[PDB]
């Protein structure tokens, strides 16, 4: 209620199922707004980059 988070959202953050942003430091995914919920795949893209190996 205080932070305007839903039950699902608070669970996903609290039990390490989704990230939440405290400073987007000018990120882009439409840019990244504070208090946004990013999956680990999305956060990996934005934090470590996109790449791929092909055999």
């Amino acid at each position: 209620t205080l932070l305007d988070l839903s039950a699902t959202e608070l669970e996903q953050v609290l039990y390490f199922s989704k990230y939440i942003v405290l400073d987007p430091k000018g990120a882009i995914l439409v840019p990244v707004e504070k208090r946004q919920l990013l999956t680990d795949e999305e956060y990996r893209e934005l934090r470590y980059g996109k790449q791929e190996t092909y055999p």
Binding site: V13, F16, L22, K25, Y43
Partner: peptide
């Protein structure tokens, strides 16, 4: 290419 984004998990974030 990647930003220094600050996105946390858990009760530390909250």
């Amino acid at each position: 290419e990647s930003y220094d984004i600050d996105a946390r998990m858990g009760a530390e974030a909250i």
